[PDB]
Amino acid sequence: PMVLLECDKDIPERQKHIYLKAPNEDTREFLPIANAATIPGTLSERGCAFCGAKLVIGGVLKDTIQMIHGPLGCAYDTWHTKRYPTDNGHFNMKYVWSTDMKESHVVFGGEKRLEKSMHEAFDEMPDIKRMIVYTTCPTALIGDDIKAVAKKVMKDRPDVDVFTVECPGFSGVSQSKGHHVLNIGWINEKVETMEKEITSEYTMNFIGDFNIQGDTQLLQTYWDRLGIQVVAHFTGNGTYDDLRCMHQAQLNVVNCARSSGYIANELKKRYGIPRLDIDSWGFNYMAEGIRKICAFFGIEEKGEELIAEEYAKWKPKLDWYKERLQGKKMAIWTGGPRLWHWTKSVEDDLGVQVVAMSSKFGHEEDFEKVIARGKEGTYYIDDGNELEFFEIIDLVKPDVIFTGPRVGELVKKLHIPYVNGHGYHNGPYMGFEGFVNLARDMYNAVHNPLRHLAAVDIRDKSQTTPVIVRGAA
Amino acid sequence: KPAEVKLSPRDREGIINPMYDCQPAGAQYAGIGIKDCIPLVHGGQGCTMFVRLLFAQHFKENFDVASTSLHEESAVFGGAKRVEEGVLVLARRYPNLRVIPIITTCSTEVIGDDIEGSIRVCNRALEAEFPDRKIYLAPVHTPSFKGSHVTGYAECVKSVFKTITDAHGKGQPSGKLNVFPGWVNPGDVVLLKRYFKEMDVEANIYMDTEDFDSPMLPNKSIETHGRTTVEDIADSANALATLSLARYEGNTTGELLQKTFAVPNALVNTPYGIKNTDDMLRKIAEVTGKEIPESLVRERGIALDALADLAHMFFANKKVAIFGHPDLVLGLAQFCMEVELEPVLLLIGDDQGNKYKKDPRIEELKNTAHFDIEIVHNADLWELEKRINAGLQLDLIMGHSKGRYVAIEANIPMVRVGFPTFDRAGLYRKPSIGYQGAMELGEMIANAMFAHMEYTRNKEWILNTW
Amino acid sequence: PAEVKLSPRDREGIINPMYDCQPAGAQYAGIGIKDCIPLVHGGQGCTMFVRLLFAQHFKENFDVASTSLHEESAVFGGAKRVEEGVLVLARRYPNLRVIPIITTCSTEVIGDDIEGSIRVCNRALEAEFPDRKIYLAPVHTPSFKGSHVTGYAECVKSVFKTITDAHGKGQPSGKLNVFPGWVNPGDVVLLKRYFKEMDVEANIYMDTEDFDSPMLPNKSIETHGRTTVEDIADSANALATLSLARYEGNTTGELLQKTFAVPNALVNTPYGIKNTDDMLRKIAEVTGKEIPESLVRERGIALDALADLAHMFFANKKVAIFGHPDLVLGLAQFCMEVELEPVLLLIGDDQGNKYKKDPRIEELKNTAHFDIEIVHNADLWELEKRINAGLQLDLIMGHSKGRYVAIEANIPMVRVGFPTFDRAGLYRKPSIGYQGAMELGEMIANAMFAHMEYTRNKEWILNTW
Numbered sequence A: 001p002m003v004l005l006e007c008d009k010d011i012p013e014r015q016k017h018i019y020l021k022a023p024n025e026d027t028r029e030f031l032p033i034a035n036a037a038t039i040p041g042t043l044s045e046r047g048c049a050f051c052g053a054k055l056v057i058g059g060v061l062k063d064t065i066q067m068i069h070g071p072l073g074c075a076y077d078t079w080h081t082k083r084y085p086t087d088n089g090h091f092n093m094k095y096v097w098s099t100d101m102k103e104s105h106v107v108f109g110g111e112k113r114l115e116k117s118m119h120e121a122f123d124e125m126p127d128i129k130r131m132i133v134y135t136t137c138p139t140a141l142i143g144d145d146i147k148a149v150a151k152k153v154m155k156d157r158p159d160v161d162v163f164t165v166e167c168p169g170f171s172g173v174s175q176s177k178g179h180h181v182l183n184i185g186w187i188n189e190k191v192e193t194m195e196k197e198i199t200s201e202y203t204m205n206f207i208g209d210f211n212i213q214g215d216t217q218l219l220q221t222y223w224d225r226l227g228i229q230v231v232a233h234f235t236g237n238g239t240y241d242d243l244r245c246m247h248q249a250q251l252n253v254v255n256c257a258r259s260s261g262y263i264a265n266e267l268k269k270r271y272g273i274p275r276l277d278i279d280s281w282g283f284n285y286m287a288e289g290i291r292k293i294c295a296f297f298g299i300e301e302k303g304e305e306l307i308a309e310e311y312a313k314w315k316p317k318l319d320w321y322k323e324r325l326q327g328k329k330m331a332i333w334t335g336g337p338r339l340w341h342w343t344k345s346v347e348d349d350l351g352v353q354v355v356a357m358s359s360k361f362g363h364e365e366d367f368e369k370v371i372a373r374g375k376e377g378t379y380y381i382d383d384g385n386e387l388e389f390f391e392i393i394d395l396v397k398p399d400v401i402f403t404g405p406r407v408g409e410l411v412k413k414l415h416i417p418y419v420n421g422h423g424y425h426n427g428p429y430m431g432f433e434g435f436v437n438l439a440r441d442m443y444n445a446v447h448n449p450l451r452h453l454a455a456v457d458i459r460d461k462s463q464t465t466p467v468i469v470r471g472a473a
Numbered sequence B: 001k002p003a004e005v006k007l008s009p010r011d012r013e014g015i016i017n018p019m020y021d022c023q024p025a026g027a028q029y030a031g032i033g034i035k036d037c038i039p040l041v042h043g044g045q046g047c048t049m050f051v052r053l054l055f056a057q058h059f060k061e062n063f064d065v066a067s068t069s070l071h072e073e074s075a076v077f078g079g080a081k082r083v084e085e086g087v088l089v090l091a092r093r094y095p096n097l098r099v100i101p102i103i104t105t106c107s108t109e110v111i112g113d114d115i116e117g118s119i120r121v122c123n124r125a126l127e128a129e130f131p132d133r134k135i136y137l138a139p140v141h142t143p144s145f146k147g148s149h150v151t152g153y154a155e156c157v158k159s160v161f162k163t164i165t166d167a168h169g170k171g172q173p174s175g176k177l178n179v180f181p182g183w184v185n186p187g188d189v190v191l192l193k194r195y196f197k198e199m200d201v202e203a204n205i206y207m208d209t210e211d212f213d214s215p216m217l218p219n220k221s222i223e224t225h226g227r228t229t230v231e232d233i234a235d236s237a238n239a240l241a242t243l244s245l246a247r248y249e250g251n252t253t254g255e256l257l258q259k260t261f262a263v264p265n266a267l268v269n270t271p272y273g274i275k276n277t278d279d280m281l282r283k284i285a286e287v288t289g290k291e292i293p294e295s296l297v298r299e300r301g302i303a304l305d306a307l308a309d310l311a312h313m314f315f316a317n318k319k320v321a322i323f324g325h326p327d328l329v330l331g332l333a334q335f336c337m338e339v340e341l342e343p344v345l346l347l348i349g350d351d352q353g354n355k356y357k358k359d360p361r362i363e364e365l366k367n368t369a370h371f372d373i374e375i376v377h378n379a380d381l382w383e384l385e386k387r388i389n390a391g392l393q394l395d396l397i398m399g400h401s402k403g404r405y406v407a408i409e410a411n412i413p414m415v416r417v418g419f420p421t422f423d424r425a426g427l428y429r430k431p432s433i434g435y436q437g438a439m440e441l442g443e444m445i446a447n448a449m450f451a452h453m454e455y456t457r458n459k460e461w462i463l464n465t466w
Numbered sequence C: 001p002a003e004v005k006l007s008p009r010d011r012e013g014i015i016n017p018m019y020d021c022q023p024a025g026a027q028y029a030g031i032g033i034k035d036c037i038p039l040v041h042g043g044q045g046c047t048m049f050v051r052l053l054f055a056q057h058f059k060e061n062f063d064v065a066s067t068s069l070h071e072e073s074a075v076f077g078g079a080k081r082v083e084e085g086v087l088v089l090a091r092r093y094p095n096l097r098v099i100p101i102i103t104t105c106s107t108e109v110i111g112d113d114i115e116g117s118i119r120v121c122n123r124a125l126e127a128e129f130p131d132r133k134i135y136l137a138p139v140h141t142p143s144f145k146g147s148h149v150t151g152y153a154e155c156v157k158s159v160f161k162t163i164t165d166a167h168g169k170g171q172p173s174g175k176l177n178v179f180p181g182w183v184n185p186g187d188v189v190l191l192k193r194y195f196k197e198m199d200v201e202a203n204i205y206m207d208t209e210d211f212d213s214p215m216l217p218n219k220s221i222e223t224h225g226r227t228t229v230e231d232i233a234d235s236a237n238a239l240a241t242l243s244l245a246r247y248e249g250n251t252t253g254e255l256l257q258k259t260f261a262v263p264n265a266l267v268n269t270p271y272g273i274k275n276t277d278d279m280l281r282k283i284a285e286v287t288g289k290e291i292p293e294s295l296v297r298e299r300g301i302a303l304d305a306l307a308d309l310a311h312m313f314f315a316n317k318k319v320a321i322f323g324h325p326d327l328v329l330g331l332a333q334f335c336m337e338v339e340l341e342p343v344l345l346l347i348g349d350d351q352g353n354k355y356k357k358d359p360r361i362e363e364l365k366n367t368a369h370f371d372i373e374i375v376h377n378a379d380l381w382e383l384e385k386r387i388n389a390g391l392q393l394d395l396i397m398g399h400s401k402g403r404y405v406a407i408e409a410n411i412p413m414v415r416v417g418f419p420t421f422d423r424a425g426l427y428r429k430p431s432i433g434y435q436g437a438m439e440l441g442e443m444i445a446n447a448m449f450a451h452m453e454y455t456r457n458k459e460w461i462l463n464t465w
Ligand code: CLF
Pocket: A048, A049, A050, A051, A070, A071, A072, A073, A074, A075, A077, A135, A136, A137, A138, A167, A168, A169, A170, B022, B023, B024, B043, B044, B045, B046, B047, B048, B050, B104, B105, B106, B107, B144
């Protein structure tokens, strides 16, 4: 049934957002409302639309200035917070750019301030030739025309190319609208503005993977072994110009259908490129995804050779962790898709029971997927807030929580360990090896002497201090 | 040609690699140090969530801050109802809540929401709904297109003190000092508490952030809270005097309490290094009539003993760049010269240069330095990287962790100071001010240099009989 | 196949010794006594090199004298050098009260009769200084057995025997005796705070807090041990002895039990959380005093800090540890609490027959999920050679004379034990107790973090841990 938590008695609209799956229900009658307005004052976990454009998608690129048109805080706040390495020295993580909007610019306009800042950025780093300009709350409100500015800068600097995103934080309700605006703008303005050499009979784009701790680079070892050319990664370890070539691919392989389904859908519509949805987290999921890709291309045997070698290399360690993680209870409190990518994969491959899930910004689509794959007795929460997390802990008593670091540091006080479900602990977590990495961190999180020590009150004469025996795969 | 101390602005309009966050972030930091306080940030959701993450990076702890969740409708038609609902949702769900600083953002400053009017609405609504509670709503005007998190911190402290002392007024003299240490770590607060205890001086430290470093307890209780209460803030009207340690981080509240309540304010140099600590203690003795204790003479002497093992051997003539909050940059430059380091480049990150030019510590540096010093105001961290790229030779950087890649790539040892220091463990527990703090800064500098000598094989055999 | 194995060094010679010889440890014991100047009976290097070693660790001078054995004494015996040395000390240092007379390899080989010289000097001193008492303690420390660890223990025991022989049993003091072993001033400061917070009166033997002495306006020299004759004499009258170090003072606790019926309680050296917990439980047991809330809180702050590190940065990382035996075994237990894997433990002297009986071995055997090699009679070449043969380590914990092993192998290294001369201020930083466990864990993490930056090994990950 839908659940009215005690902490939500005075915001009873939250009942429509929390589903406890029970036997024999027709789940179509119990789909959480999702992607609706946030309730003010709740300590919702949601971020802003600008975040979804710059931090999540655009800022992954290795060769692009990220020009944030606004006051300095939006820039400061999106710098030193992500773990998306590159193969060029992590340019994307080292720098952030602001137009340093001041009061004058609010009153009289910021277009000249943006123009000057763009020329300065290109002058300070002459080997960087690509830029994305983002609006933020106040530059949207005052109506600065960033597309016109970008057009002028490109006329004045024939060596550069600039893309613009109109993504103030108050757009939409969450990060999600930033994903949408960036996807649609990119396909409308930049796809089919360049081409690259095709060097394989088999070509694809990999859509919706952001190279967290090197995920994309690990998956690329598969594509290289299979002889498949990736035209563009959207956007993990990617380049601006590769994204201009996306119309050339034969296949679009989608992992993050939430942030990046939009562009896959438009590429299918405009160019006829099929959309294949996979799960690139999960051990047996990864095998299924490789088999689908190889079946599409007619290279089934190459796929079987790869899968056999990866199972021989990694399945024994995975099974060691499954033996020790069987029956452990997990919560997943992340953006949305990892709920449906992980609930059944940790169950199948690790024996782990996901007892509670919360999505910051998922849509009803995401809840359809997670509820289809998820257990009975589990809580499914749209746009969860901090007091709800405490009540859910009291209801389901998780052994481990996959969530962001700040919430991890909160639940530590309750003696509950965490794994960073966003930026990982010791990743990558995609692929065969990556699911072993995920399992290892879950194992070390839960089988942790400090948890046991913390429970002991040394003042209690009846208590001793235990020693715990651990293992390694 | 005599040494010159030169102030100059950043020569670019834009920013690359900002040194500070925006005003609302600093207002949030001020508020999280108050017991039974949840700041409410009136604007889009990122303005809250990114700052809660920033605090988690520095402290490795959660702090509670709420958003009004400005969306499209409210951006176009006004956000008063988002404020008003957010205050009520907080009060309904947090029965012990007492203080809500209502912090504006760029968005809600641009659209001109009437925060004082929303507070009147909310006060009416809260008095009807909760006749047995008193919740203090403080209007905090922090447009992000002026100043920085430094100015936003100062503005929020001042507004919260105005709000609470307006309600309570002046009463029974307390016999206590007010102390505004500025934006410091828990370890700095621990040290100040010890100094006041050893000198038998009663004081309130605003804000008391000691418990930000909270235990993991057998009973699972959460103690990660500010310790400064409504009552403590209200009592500031009754103090003997205010000791303001930070010109840019709370002195304006000391000034307000002097103007409103005749509490005399004493602004001193921020106590980085030996002389500044000595002069702070002399001021405390003057205002209180209490003697400086032998215990502090001894702590001072242990610090000097430790620093004397380092200064002429390892520090003399080494060139340093320092960035961070202005009180910290200027104070660390003075500390550096006590130990024979040469702070040749000081970077201060905001638009307050008209004030910095009048800081008496500039003149103190002009009258002491034997080497040129460039003080860049309105600086970003690209101002540092570009100068190194152009040939500036540095032996040490002192600054916060968002400058780390500058030091890493240039192969320059860096000591992490100020806020945020997320890329090393435990620094929030270390003092940087006072005598113990001077000692621990100097030993961090030496140990950073020593490790660098080993990694680079630069006379690494010399670390034996120093 | 899960095995903790003890083995000896397989070479007769030493390359890169882990410890100094017995007389050096006896000197260290003595310099913690107020109004004490040890007299080292042997050649001059046996004194001067050890005064240098203490200056390397502490960055301070300590006073120790030599008998200056020369060629004539090597032929005819050196008793007259002892006797002269005692009188020259007494005549030139009017406040001197205690002289441990420490033998060396030379004076052990030639068989000088130290006890006979002490009788001569006691008669001379009583005649020449009628209103003074100087305690001469014979300390037999041949360097061709044991190590500075054994020498420390021997000197403490001899000094206590000498002083308590002279004063005997008096009125009950209500205090604990505490022998922390060979620890830093910072460890002593932490223990004093624990006993203060628990409202337990205690003497810490020796009290080395003031080794970290101020540079004072009045130019006063305060770099002295604080343990007095009176403090040592009062050990006879204690409620109980708490011995923290099996190899570094427990034998003095036993002597006081045998002689004065002061019950001795030997506990695991308090490295890490459990060992600290168990120390405090023993204190509570023997005193009847409750463990205070303040120590529950310090414990919780340490656990909170270590929990930010253990599964993220420490789990499955392989560690080698060297140092004094009580420190090595205690740090191995601490390592395990934070998910580190101490695969190689090196203990540097000939006391293997004792180490095989240490109950902490069994505590490791019953807990480790990885093989542990414990090499006794080890030198530091035992570490370097194993690394050269392929042993993969993520961390070394040990004293500064191992530094080049870590530097050349490019392995991060945390400086622990004695001497730690190649970093600043470590003598002031506790390693024992809850705050010490936290400080050690954060040194480990910060050494790893710097290493990640210098080697460009996922250095971008240090943002949102
Ligand atoms: S919801 Fe998002 S992060 Fe917020 S402002 Fe809006 S685009 Fe940006 Fe920016 S400068 Fe500071 S952090 Fe805000 S108050 Fe403005």
